[PDB]
Structure 1
Amino acid sequence: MYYLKNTNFWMFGLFFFFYFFIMGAYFPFFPIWLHDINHISKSDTGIIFAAISLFSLLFQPLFGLLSDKLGLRKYLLWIITGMLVMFAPFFIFIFGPLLQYNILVGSIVGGIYLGFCFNAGAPAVEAFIEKVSRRSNFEFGRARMFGCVGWALCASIVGIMFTINNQFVFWLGSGCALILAVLLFFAKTDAPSSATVANAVGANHSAFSLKLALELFRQPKLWFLSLYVIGVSCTYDVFDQQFANFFTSFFATGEQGTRVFGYVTTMGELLNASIMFFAPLIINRIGGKNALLLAGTIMSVRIIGSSFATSALEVVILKTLHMFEVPFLLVGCFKYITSQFEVRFSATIYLVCFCFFKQLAMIFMSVLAGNMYESIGFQGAYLVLGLVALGFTLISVFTLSGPGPLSLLRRQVNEVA
């Protein structure tokens, strides 16, 4: 509670909150804004989303390998924040109106060309704020819990006021970007008060080596983990990046249909919260490789159940069937990898794997479901992948490297010793 008085704690538990709150529209909602609001065929977003991934992938490095080391002098965030006061002014003026000039090609390109600030942006905010957090006293361990509740408070208003007035949310989105994103820059801090003098003296920068990857590349744990990451997660996300409309159509109208947009997510969070706590116990008292597959088992049922999607208050369940993976996978990797690779490796795993590969699977994969959807449908496409992926969660039963190689429980000293 010594955080009670903490200033830079107060000034960033807000930055987090009022940024995620900001992003707290653009994305989850996004899909609607395409189809409904701006009528665009699924397959045309299957190219949007697929392209979104192309900017990410070949960018994320440039912020990580950049800021992480070089620029750690509080700048970039101004670069990001800059492209944020132009939330609506882009969307409602440029992004939207561009594609409408039917050239999806050049329009979606000059699109997530302001989609990074959120995709590769957040992890950048999440970043600096962490670095800074740690140096101040009270880390990000709870200041984010102050930022991931903007999803919440927002969510409802974004799934509501948007319908009534689409410009509202977006227009307001640049404002909470203005006075709110900036106010925390003329009230920020950057001086490591009485610690060390140099930046290469006392931190926690694991490093990335090409060789490193190459000493990991011979490894089966790697490929066979990837297999999971890929198929399961990948094609899983793919499905969600274009699930909505589906679920949305099930209701009375758009208002009722959507609305359950805020109401949905805005709920599961206080539930994804719940899980969060009591996860480890399970996880660890369950093992990562194991408990991980159960997330993939879960996802599956969500794409697989979606073949049947009968009711509207069924599809709701098929949504909240979401926060049951969020946990299990998330940390299930953390403790899987950790617990199956030479620690210093993480870089490449987390890097190579969940990027120089995923976004890559995503470039392709997605597009398929975009055409898979428009030409054969939501339930149709599902059975292809709701299945195809299940054939991974199912094979990864073998595929993946089980419970401890040559250490029964002795080579276990990392979080309590």
Structure 2
Amino acid sequence: MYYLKNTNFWMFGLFFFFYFFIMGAYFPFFPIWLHDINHISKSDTGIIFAAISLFSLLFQPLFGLLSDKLGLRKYLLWIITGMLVMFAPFFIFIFGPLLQYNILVGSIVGGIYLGFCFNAGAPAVEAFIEKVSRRSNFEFGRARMFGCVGWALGASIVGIMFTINNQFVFWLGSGCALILAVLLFFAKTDAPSSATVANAVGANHSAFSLKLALELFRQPKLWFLSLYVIGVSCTYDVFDQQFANFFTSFFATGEQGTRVFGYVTTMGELLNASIMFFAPLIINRIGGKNALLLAGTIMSVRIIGSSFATSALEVVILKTLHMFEVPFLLVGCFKYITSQFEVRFSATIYLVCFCFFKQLAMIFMSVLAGNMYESIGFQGAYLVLGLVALGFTLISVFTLSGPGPLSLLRRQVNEVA
């Protein structure tokens, strides 16, 4: 409408419906392809999802220094794309072999960089795209809920495709989503207008200092969130690493236990989208902390729950819980962080607690998770994590800063208005 003649909306919206069609491939069916197509150690998928986190942490950062000190040049974001023209050659001809030709540490390391154009590129893409929403007038959130259908159709299509042939994907994702999610450039923007003639605006900014850090470090309420963050999350995070094959087991053909999976995920948007609607409202009445516990109570139940699975139906209810949670989490982390911290801090709070610490707590965790799914298989390991996760959760109905104890409108309603 207000975008019909608006072209970069189409451009970057479509660029969003392609960067996320690939996501919808590479991500949910990673476990499957690894372990099945490649047949890989129930504990060595850990040394992979492991190197995965150790780098998304060496890049999520350095990618800031680019994402902005670079501004409107697609440059960086063009490496990302070109690197994704080789999705195929890579897994098929390099990633797959390296691992499998059982040289595996020296194959993930040297193969966990096409994880760079995903872990610390997926957000990176999402930035650049809003810097355009500005200059070009889109409700960024109108073009991002564009790349949401792509990851919905992604899963569905891909899964069904995947079975039929794992190969006829890395070739689809490497073109179907590459040559376009790349060709969507020769038609773009740069113009130092629609911002300020000089530099009065153009691309929102912020700061992350040492003292800032050293200040938070002084703060306990930072620590208690660093508790919930490393405790409930990181832990849940890895729960999902492997979970996909633990899924496919409760099914007829494994080559049917996939599709279903691709389905449970496609229906996620079709769920989470709705959930997301109310959410705020709710979050803002329930009060952050509470809603962060709400998320651990589930996260938690899903782990323990899974540790007691017997059938398929159950397992297709655990994979559906992961959905209610998420909303109440990121949206919760947001509303708590904010209701509990100095806006100046906010920036740093994320990098420091949500990127440096969790990815760290995961470089380690997902190794003893795989080393654990061996000595005790899944369901056993699930009891461990399930408890450690719920434990911490009760510990937070205590630690996390309640609903504004020494300020309810100056440290709770202040940022609000």
TM-score (norm 1): 0.97
In the alignment, the residues of structure 2 paired with residue 367 and residue 289 of structure 1 have an alpha-carbon distance, to the nearest angstrom, of 30
In the alignment, the residues of structure 2 paired with residue 172 and residue 308 of structure 1 have an alpha-carbon distance, to the nearest angstrom, of 38
Shift of 1:408: 2.9
1:291-350 per-residue CA deviation (whole Å, 9 max, x = no partner) reads 111101000000010111111111000110111111011110000010101111011111
The verdict on how the C-alpha distance between 1:416 and 1:358 changes in structure 2, with shifts beyond 3 A counting, is closer
The verdict on how the C-alpha distance between 1:391 and 1:167 changes in structure 2, with shifts beyond 3 A counting, is same
1:379-414 per-residue CA deviation (whole Å, 9 max, x = no partner) reads 100110111110011110101111113223355556
The answer on whether the counterparts of 1:17 and 1:148 sit within 8 Å (CA) in structure 2 is yes
In the alignment, the residues of structure 2 paired with residue 86 and residue 273 of structure 1 have an alpha-carbon distance, to the nearest angstrom, of 32
Shift of 1:93: 0.9
Q: Secondary structure at the match of 2:314?
A: coil
1:166-190 per-residue CA deviation (whole Å, 9 max, x = no partner) reads 1111111111233312221011112
- 1:218-229 matches, within 5 Å, as 218-229=218-229
Q: Secondary structure at the match of 2:12?
A: helix
In the alignment, the residues of structure 1 paired with residue 373 and residue 384 of structure 2 have an alpha-carbon distance, to the nearest angstrom, of 10
In the alignment, the residues of structure 2 paired with residue 350 and residue 308 of structure 1 have an alpha-carbon distance, to the nearest angstrom, of 34
Q: Report which stretch shifted further, 43-52 or 134-143.
A: 134-143
In the alignment, the residues of structure 1 paired with residue 384 and residue 104 of structure 2 have an alpha-carbon distance, to the nearest angstrom, of 26
The answer on whether the counterparts of 2:55 and 2:116 sit within 8 Å (CA) in structure 1 is yes
Q: Secondary structure at the match of 2:252?
A: coil
Q: Report which stretch shifted further, 199-208 or 273-282.
A: 199-208
In the alignment, the residues of structure 2 paired with residue 351 and residue 165 of structure 1 have an alpha-carbon distance, to the nearest angstrom, of 39
In the alignment, the residues of structure 1 paired with residue 61 and residue 241 of structure 2 have an alpha-carbon distance, to the nearest angstrom, of 23
1:188-230 per-residue CA deviation (whole Å, 9 max, x = no partner) reads 1121435423346454201111111111111111000010011
In the alignment, the residues of structure 2 paired with residue 314 and residue 69 of structure 1 have an alpha-carbon distance, to the nearest angstrom, of 49
The answer on whether the counterparts of 2:156 and 2:266 sit within 8 Å (CA) in structure 1 is yes
Q: Partner residue of 1:154?
A: 154
Aligned residues: 417
In the alignment, the residues of structure 2 paired with residue 203 and residue 107 of structure 1 have an alpha-carbon distance, to the nearest angstrom, of 38
Shift of 1:55: 1.2
The answer on whether the counterparts of 1:74 and 1:190 sit within 8 Å (CA) in structure 2 is no
The answer on whether the counterparts of 1:9 and 1:138 sit within 8 Å (CA) in structure 2 is yes
The verdict on how the C-alpha distance between 1:139 and 1:192 changes in structure 2, with shifts beyond 3 A counting, is farther
Q: Report which stretch shifted further, 388-397 or 183-192.
A: 183-192
In the alignment, the residues of structure 2 paired with residue 69 and residue 75 of structure 1 have an alpha-carbon distance, to the nearest angstrom, of 12
The verdict on how the C-alpha distance between 1:199 and 1:177 changes in structure 2, with shifts beyond 3 A counting, is farther
Q: Partner residue of 1:184?
A: 184
The answer on whether the counterparts of 1:14 and 1:146 sit within 8 Å (CA) in structure 2 is yes
Q: Report which stretch shifted further, 271-280 or 255-264.
A: 255-264
In the alignment, the residues of structure 1 paired with residue 29 and residue 194 of structure 2 have an alpha-carbon distance, to the nearest angstrom, of 45
Q: Secondary structure at the match of 1:325?
A: helix
The verdict on how the C-alpha distance between 1:9 and 1:214 changes in structure 2, with shifts beyond 3 A counting, is same
Q: Alignment RMSD, CA only?
A: 1.5
1:80-138 per-residue CA deviation (whole Å, 9 max, x = no partner) reads 10100000110111100111220111101111121110110111001100111122111
In the alignment, the residues of structure 1 paired with residue 12 and residue 203 of structure 2 have an alpha-carbon distance, to the nearest angstrom, of 21
Q: Report which stretch shifted further, 249-258 or 199-208.
A: 199-208
Shift of 1:152: 0.8
Which 5+ residue runs of structure 1 have no aligned equivalent?
none
The verdict on how the C-alpha distance between 1:399 and 1:411 changes in structure 2, with shifts beyond 3 A counting, is closer
Q: Report which stretch shifted further, 353-362 or 193-202.
A: 193-202
The answer on whether the counterparts of 1:81 and 1:177 sit within 8 Å (CA) in structure 2 is no
Q: Report which stretch shifted further, 286-295 or 3-12.
A: 3-12
The verdict on how the C-alpha distance between 1:414 and 1:180 changes in structure 2, with shifts beyond 3 A counting, is farther
1:135-157 per-residue CA deviation (whole Å, 9 max, x = no partner) reads 21113112110001111111112
Q: Partner residue of 2:204?
A: 204
Q: Report which stretch shifted further, 177-186 or 51-60.
A: 177-186
| 1:416 maps onto 2:416 in alignment | yes
The verdict on how the C-alpha distance between 1:398 and 1:179 changes in structure 2, with shifts beyond 3 A counting, is same
The verdict on how the C-alpha distance between 1:289 and 1:194 changes in structure 2, with shifts beyond 3 A counting, is closer
In the alignment, the residues of structure 2 paired with residue 412 and residue 385 of structure 1 have an alpha-carbon distance, to the nearest angstrom, of 33
Q: Secondary structure at the match of 1:308?
A: coil
The verdict on how the C-alpha distance between 1:37 and 1:414 changes in structure 2, with shifts beyond 3 A counting, is farther
Q: Partner residue of 1:106?
A: 106
The verdict on how the C-alpha distance between 1:203 and 1:154 changes in structure 2, with shifts beyond 3 A counting, is closer
Q: Secondary structure at the match of 2:374?
A: helix
In the alignment, the residues of structure 1 paired with residue 103 and residue 126 of structure 2 have an alpha-carbon distance, to the nearest angstrom, of 34
The answer on whether the counterparts of 2:232 and 2:392 sit within 8 Å (CA) in structure 1 is yes
The answer on whether the counterparts of 2:338 and 2:415 sit within 8 Å (CA) in structure 1 is no
In the alignment, the residues of structure 2 paired with residue 91 and residue 198 of structure 1 have an alpha-carbon distance, to the nearest angstrom, of 45
In the alignment, the residues of structure 1 paired with residue 231 and residue 194 of structure 2 have an alpha-carbon distance, to the nearest angstrom, of 49
In the alignment, the residues of structure 2 paired with residue 415 and residue 144 of structure 1 have an alpha-carbon distance, to the nearest angstrom, of 26
The verdict on how the C-alpha distance between 1:194 and 1:407 changes in structure 2, with shifts beyond 3 A counting, is closer
Q: Report which stretch shifted further, 134-143 or 344-353.
A: 134-143
Shift of 1:50: 0.8
Q: Secondary structure at the match of 1:218?
A: coil
In the alignment, the residues of structure 2 paired with residue 170 and residue 301 of structure 1 have an alpha-carbon distance, to the nearest angstrom, of 35
The answer on whether the counterparts of 2:247 and 2:261 sit within 8 Å (CA) in structure 1 is no
